[PDB]
Amino acid sequence: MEVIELNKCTSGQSFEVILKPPSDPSLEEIQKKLEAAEERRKYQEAELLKHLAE
Amino acid sequence: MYTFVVRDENSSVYAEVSRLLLATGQWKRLRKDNPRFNLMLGERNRLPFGRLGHEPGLVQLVNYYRGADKLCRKASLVKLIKTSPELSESCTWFPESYVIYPREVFLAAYNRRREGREGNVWIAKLISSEASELLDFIDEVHVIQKYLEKPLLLEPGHRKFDIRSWVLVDHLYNIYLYREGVLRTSSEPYNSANFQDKTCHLTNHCIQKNYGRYEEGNEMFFEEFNQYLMDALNTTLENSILLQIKHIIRSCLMCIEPAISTKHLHYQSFQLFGFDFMVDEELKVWLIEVNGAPACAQKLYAELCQGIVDVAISSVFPLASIFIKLHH
Amino acid sequence: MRECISIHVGQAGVQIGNACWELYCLEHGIQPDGQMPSDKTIGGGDDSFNTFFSETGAGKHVPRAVFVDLEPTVIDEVRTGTYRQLFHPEQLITGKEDAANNYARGHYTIGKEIIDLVLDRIRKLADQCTGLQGFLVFHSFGGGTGSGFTSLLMERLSVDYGKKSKLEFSIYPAPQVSTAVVEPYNSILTTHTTLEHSDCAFMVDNEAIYDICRRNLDIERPTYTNLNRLISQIVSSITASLRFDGALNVDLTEFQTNLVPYPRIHFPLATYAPVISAEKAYHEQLSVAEITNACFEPANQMVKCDPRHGKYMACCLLYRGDVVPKDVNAAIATIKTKRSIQFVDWCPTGFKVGINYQPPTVVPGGDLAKVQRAVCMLSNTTAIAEAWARLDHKFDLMYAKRAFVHWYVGEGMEEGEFSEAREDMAALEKDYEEVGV
Amino acid sequence: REIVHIQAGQCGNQIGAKFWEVISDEHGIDPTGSYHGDSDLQLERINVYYNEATGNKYVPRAILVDLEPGTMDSVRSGPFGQIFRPDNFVFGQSGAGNNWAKGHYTEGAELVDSVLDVVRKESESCDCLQGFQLTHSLGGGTGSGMGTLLISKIREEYPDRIMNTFSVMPSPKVSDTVVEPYNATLSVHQLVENTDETYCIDNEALYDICFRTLKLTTPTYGDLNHLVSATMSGVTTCLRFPGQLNADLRKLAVNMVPFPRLHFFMPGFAPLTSRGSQQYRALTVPELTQQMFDSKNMMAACDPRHGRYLTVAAIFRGRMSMKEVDEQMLNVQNKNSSYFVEWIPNNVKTAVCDIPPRGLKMSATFIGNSTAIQELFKRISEQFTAMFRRKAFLHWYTGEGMDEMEFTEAESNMNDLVSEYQQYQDA
Numbered sequence A: 001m002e003v004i005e006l007n008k009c010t011s012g013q014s015f016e017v018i019l020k021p022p023s024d025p026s027l028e029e030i031q032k033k034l035e036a037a038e039e040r041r042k043y044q045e046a047e048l049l050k051h052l053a054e
Numbered sequence B: 001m002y003t004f005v006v007r008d009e010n011s012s013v014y015a016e017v018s019r020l021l022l023a024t025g026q027w028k029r030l031r032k033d034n035p036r037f038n039l040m041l042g043e044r045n046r047l048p049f050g051r052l053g054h055e056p057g058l059v060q061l062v063n064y065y066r067g068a069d070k071l072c073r074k075a076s077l078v079k080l081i082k083t084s085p086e087l088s089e090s091c092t093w094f095p096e097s098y099v100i101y102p103r104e105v106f107l108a109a110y111n112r113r114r115e116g117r118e119g120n121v122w123i124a125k126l127i128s129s130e131a132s133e134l135l136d137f138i139d140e141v142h143v144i145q146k147y148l149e150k151p152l153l154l155e156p157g158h159r160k161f162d163i164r165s166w167v168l169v170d171h172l173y174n175i176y177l178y179r180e181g182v183l184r185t186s187s188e189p190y191n192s193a194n195f196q197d198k199t200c201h202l203t204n205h206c207i208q209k210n211y212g213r214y215e216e217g218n219e220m221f222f223e224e225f226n227q228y229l230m231d232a233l234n235t236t237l238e239n240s241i242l243l244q245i246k247h248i249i250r251s252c253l254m255c256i257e258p259a260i261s262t263k264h265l266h267y268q269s270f271q272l273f274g275f276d277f278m279v280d281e282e283l284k285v286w287l288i289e290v291n292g293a294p295a296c297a298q299k300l301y302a303e304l305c306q307g308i309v310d311v312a313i314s315s316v317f318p319l320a321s322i323f324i325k326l327h328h
Numbered sequence C: 001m002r003e004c005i006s007i008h009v010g011q012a013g014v015q016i017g018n019a020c021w022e023l024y025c026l027e028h029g030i031q032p033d034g035q036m037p038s039d040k041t042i043g044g045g046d047d048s049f050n051t052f053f054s055e056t057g058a059g060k061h062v063p064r065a066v067f068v069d070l071e072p073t074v075i076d077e078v079r080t081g082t083y084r085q086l087f088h089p090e091q092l093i094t095g096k097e098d099a100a101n102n103y104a105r106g107h108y109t110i111g112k113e114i115i116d117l118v119l120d121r122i123r124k125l126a127d128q129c130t131g132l133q134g135f136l137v138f139h140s141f142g143g144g145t146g147s148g149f150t151s152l153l154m155e156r157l158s159v160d161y162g163k164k165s166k167l168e169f170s171i172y173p174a175p176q177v178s179t180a181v182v183e184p185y186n187s188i189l190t191t192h193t194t195l196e197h198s199d200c201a202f203m204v205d206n207e208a209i210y211d212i213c214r215r216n217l218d219i220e221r222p223t224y225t226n227l228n229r230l231i232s233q234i235v236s237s238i239t240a241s242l243r244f245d246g247a248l249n250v251d252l253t254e255f256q257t258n259l260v261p262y263p264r265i266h267f268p269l270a271t272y273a274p275v276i277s278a279e280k281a282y283h284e285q286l287s288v289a290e291i292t293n294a295c296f297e298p299a300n301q302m303v304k305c306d307p308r309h310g311k312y313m314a315c316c317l318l319y320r321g322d323v324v325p326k327d328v329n330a331a332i333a334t335i336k337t338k339r340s341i342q343f344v345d346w347c348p349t350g351f352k353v354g355i356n357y358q359p360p361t362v363v364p365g366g367d368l369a370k371v372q373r374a375v376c377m378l379s380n381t382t383a384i385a386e387a388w389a390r391l392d393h394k395f396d397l398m399y400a401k402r403a404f405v406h407w408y409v410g411e412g413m414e415e416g417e418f419s420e421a422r423e424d425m426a427a428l429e430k431d432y433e434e435v436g437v
Numbered sequence D: 001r002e003i004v005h006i007q008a009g010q011c012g013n014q015i016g017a018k019f020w021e022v023i024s025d026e027h028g029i030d031p032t033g034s035y036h037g038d039s040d041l042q043l044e045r046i047n048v049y050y051n052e053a054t055g056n057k058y059v060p061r062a063i064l065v066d067l068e069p070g071t072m073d074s075v076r077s078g079p080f081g082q083i084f085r086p087d088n089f090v091f092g093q094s095g096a097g098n099n100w101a102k103g104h105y106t107e108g109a110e111l112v113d114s115v116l117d118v119v120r121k122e123s124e125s126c127d128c129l130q131g132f133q134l135t136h137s138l139g140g141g142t143g144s145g146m147g148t149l150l151i152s153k154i155r156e157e158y159p160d161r162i163m164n165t166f167s168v169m170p171s172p173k174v175s176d177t178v179v180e181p182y183n184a185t186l187s188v189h190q191l192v193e194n195t196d197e198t199y200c201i202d203n204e205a206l207y208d209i210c211f212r213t214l215k216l217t218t219p220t221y222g223d224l225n226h227l228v229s230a231t232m233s234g235v236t237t238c239l240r241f242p243g244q245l246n247a248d249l250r251k252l253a254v255n256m257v258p259f260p261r262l263h264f265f266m267p268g269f270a271p272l273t274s275r276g277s278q279q280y281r282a283l284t285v286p287e288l289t290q291q292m293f294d295s296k297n298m299m300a301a302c303d304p305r306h307g308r309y310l311t312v313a314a315i316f317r318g319r320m321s322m323k324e325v326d327e328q329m330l331n332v333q334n335k336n337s338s339y340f341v342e343w344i345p346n347n348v349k350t351a352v353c354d355i356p357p358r359g360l361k362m363s364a365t366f367i368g369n370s371t372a373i374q375e376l377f378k379r380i381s382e383q384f385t386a387m388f389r390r391k392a393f394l395h396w397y398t399g400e401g402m403d404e405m406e407f408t409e410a411e412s413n414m415n416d417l418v419s420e421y422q423q424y425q426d427a
């Protein structure tokens, strides 16, 4: 067991033990998809009010 | 009632366990994809162990041990025995085996095998001599193993055989050995002159399709085989063979226990194993392989499957011995 | 010193934030009014706790936290609670109607109204930071706000703070305490949208916290208060290195470096021990080896799974209490011989240890007993993919019939986003199997 | 999160007046609107159903609609009649004569605009309106015909609010006229399209419960409304009281309705009790759970074993072990998992409230979205066709401007609803 990078202080200490070595969308695109969903909501509500108008 | 599901219709063993469970009147079978089960007789390939033990109000149990394939595949069994200190490279009951990918470590043993001028017959899975012939067969993953040239031959017949022992490991990791074994014999006399003709070497029930000459179905059970050992060799099955078998079964399972045990898991596991042994000319037992989904013999289906329900299922789900417990 | 801003979204996020900040104040000696008598640098300073707390001239220590919920009743309990003076009113944000357990309602419909307001309040805290390193996001997978609005917030934070790390504390859904039947939908949808915007995510299965409270605290029907006090202890152990002096995990970047080799596989499994009941009259205190050995029992993990049938990529041990390096290495030597610990071949087999001498702080009157030493293990094991398997299976059963999909499409979402998110999860499950099998 | 209550017609106002009597007592409000209670759980969500007026008075957010003054005068003279805001009384004079056409197209059309004025006045004072709940029968004229006319017009003015209804289904066992299958089929057509949640309260089930179970030889409408007001109190428990499940009308619809047209719930209640007769043994939690799933406690005459449960919601009221509730609820799901669809995981959610209903120490209310509800609509489609194949009694409707084609369209849409429920019973 190799104990490396041992650092000590008043609060505590830390170290590493080794046992074996190895063998975004932009703001424009966000605003577009948020408004594309609102358009699909508006369309579904329009088709509802048109149906209720008939 | 208790509930269970069946995800392997091809299982002859647990088909009889379904009938036995249903006959109690306290077990209701559900559909394959119903998650509200107590017991799962699961599939052999890609069993969803990750979805077990997450249903509130249901103690779940499955008839397979996750990770036990390390012991039930020929390639994995060799690697486990060679690397585990519990068994170690100098394991006296496992034949020399090497994993070959379609080498250098194997050629050294074969080259000294030619140097020693001793038997250099190796099996790969199919039986060959010398060396390089077997490799071309593999290319056209396999394991090569030392073929036991001096096996115990039953008389009359001069016949080869293998021994199958059925072992049950319950949810507490108790190791149970069915008192009834079977000898899958070869109806053809053993010929060591040529191995291309393998009807007398491969003792499998399917290879035998001279079949049926000495006992029904080429199956010699322990009652008759024990009497033969007394008459012919002045010994018993318990002393000459069965002690080594119980030692091998216990050694293999205790090795992989920390990796497969479900002692503190959210679900529980049991599993039936099929150990295949090879007895040589000096009454020494050799482990050929372990089987994860083994079939039984028709004579023993009714008794063994009844014991699986009693010891593995009813122990966790009680209702309203044929096993030898290997202690550890 | 570099500052961290915490963000709590939805009911699960806000109530867990209350538990963590209550615990932080007890650990740093800060009172409900924000006064810290031990702090001798009045009105400023760059100590380690200033990572999580700002300072006013009057001596108040204000958390660098913002609470957001699309509905007011949970945050209203914060505005009038024991720590009402701790927070400024501008960092507590509420709407009027919630997402109704609907991801698409929280992401598109209601989320669009309030996203610009939250980012401004977040900007207010960030302008007080001489060197922001990133954010800690607390939310649930199953909630309509916790899933929907978080994914929208995580998208925008990558835009306005492209150089900042972002860590998640997520509540994996469990039917024993879940409130909605569509939580598998919300879970997959938010994980797909957030996967590329999070650098390290600590999942917490409520099923695991529930059974731990039943098993080790003797509580027959644990409540959110019970769960959240235990969760805050784990979260406190994880963040303790940011709030205290040390050399391990001193910034958010070090969490990704020490725990996340592959960006997508960034879900470390957290294991914590010991959990001891305060009602237990007689208790034999556990040693270093006993509590380190407990880190490899699945019954102590934040997610129930079997690490023996996976492969490790990283492993940290965070000790709190009377621990010394000699006892740790002695414990690791025994455990390596008795347990299946397989590392991936392209990684060194080893542990990064951090020790804090101050024993775990327990809230007065809580369910947890005071112990002499405790440990939280952070291990990036492929076995955590079992939770994705469970989650995707429930997703597949419902979506095959298109059950409840009309509620999401009616909010402006497209049915294709379902299968798009599920395809990403199918890739994530495949990456785990590549690395671990 | 306010809810606007509407009661239309004779049945709508009689079960509606009884509903307000029952929940006012549960919240500690007297017939004069003064709160004289003891616990503060009674007032924490009191604004969902009540407006706070001058002098700390509570006015029900209720609107009373009828085309006759008869029943609505009985309500104003009733025990709790003075609690209702007098401006919310909107009534005509001619009545509807058990005629869907009079309520929907002619007589009700004259009055529907003044009702919507009171609706609008109550909605404008709302901090955040969840939606509406309507109480009505489907067999009469006002509550059936005008009720669905209101729902259509409320959905036009508040398209993003939840429409919930308590709908009483007609039965020849408790029949006023022969045209009830006509009015019900025309009304169910409207409910399938313009509501989010409908509680199917079958008068046949209420009669069988009063006859077979409660041992009442000749039940009255007062005996039937006792079961209704107890069920209505139980299903609205999680909306009126605080708990781990703090719910609104939208969350209930999101979690109970996997497909928009399949939103007709089987209400259930346990223990079944009759008026003026109190039983003294409190039920154990296993008994509450056993009875609430028993068909004999269902308020819709459908055999739940003839179908499968899509979603189930349950409420337990009283002081009891919530652990024992979880075990028993899981015990029902695990011993009868064939009657719960497997393609909706964990489709049974249970909620507990500490306040029990009046006269009981423990109670259990059941809300089931089962495909067995098709039996109710099949029953009404048979009684419809028996008359319509001969065009019998159709002159009452064609005299008000209706065409035979509108009846054919309603008959077809209901048969489509039945076959749609059958689609998920086989899956």
Ligand SMILES: Nc1nc2c(ncn2[C@@H]2O[C@H](COP(=O)(O)OP(=O)(O)OP(=O)(O)O)[C@@H](O)[C@H]2O)c(=O)[nH]1
Pocket: C009, C010, C011, C012, C013, C015, C016, C069, C070, C071, C098, C099, C100, C101, C102, C106, C140, C141, C142, C143, C144, C145, C146, C147, C171, C172, C173, C174, C177, C178, C179, C180, C183, C206, C224, C227, C228, C231
């Ligand atoms: N551990 C824990 N889990 C919680 C808590 N509150 C809710 N949950 C879980 O989170 C899921 C529901 O998410 P919520 O946070 O309640 O929903 P939300 O974020 O407010 O979203 P909406 O209510 O739909 O607007 C369920 O699985 C709950 O079990 C909590 O305080 N602690």
Ligand SMILES: Nc1ncnc2c1ncn2[C@@H]1O[C@H](COP(=O)(O)OP(=O)(O)CP(=O)(O)O)[C@@H](O)[C@H]1O
Pocket: B095, B123, B125, B145, B146, B147, B148, B149, B161, B162, B201, B202, B203, B204, B276, B278, B288, B289, B291
């Ligand atoms: N090392 C060896 N030496 C001698 N004979 C061997 C041998 N290995 C195998 N055999 C013979 O070959 C037969 C088949 O070998 P093997 O057991 O590997 O195949 P298999 O897996 O199809 C049988 P099962 O699956 O039922 O256990 C054995 O029954 C035995 O008779």
Ligand SMILES: Nc1nc2c(ncn2[C@@H]2O[C@H](COP(=O)(O)OP(=O)(O)O)[C@@H](O)[C@H]2O)c(=O)[nH]1
Pocket: D008, D009, D010, D011, D012, D014, D015, D096, D097, D098, D099, D137, D138, D139, D140, D141, D142, D143, D144, D168, D169, D170, D171, D174, D175, D176, D180, D203, D206, D221, D222, D224, D225, D228
């Ligand atoms: N359960 C119940 N059903 C009723 C009541 N009054 C009428 N009904 C039923 O409703 C139908 C008549 O509807 P009704 O309300 O009188 O018509 P409307 O006043 O014109 O809207 C018949 O099928 C009755 O069985 C009542 O008080 N309780």
Ligand SMILES: COc1ccc2c(c1)NC(=O)CN2c1nc(Cl)nc2ccoc12
Pocket: C179, C180, C181, D235, D236, D237, D238, D239, D245, D246, D247, D248, D251, D252, D255, D256, D311, D312, D313, D314, D315, D346, D347, D348, D349, D350, D351
């Ligand atoms: C199928 O799973 C469900 C079912 C029902 C609900 C929920 C999930 N979750 C909610 O928030 C609303 N809801 C509920 N609503 C209301 Cl008024 N009473 C109850 C009683 C139990 O559940 C309730």
Ligand SMILES: [Ca+2]
Pocket: C039, C040, C041, C042, C043, C044, C045, C046, C055
């Ligand atoms: Ca300071």
Ligand SMILES: [Mg+2]
Pocket: B289, B290, B291
């Ligand atoms: Mg084999």
Ligand SMILES: [Mg+2]
Pocket: C010, C011, C071, C098, C143, C145
């Ligand atoms: Mg919420």
Ligand SMILES: [Mg+2]
Pocket: D010, D140, D176
């Ligand atoms: Mg009438």
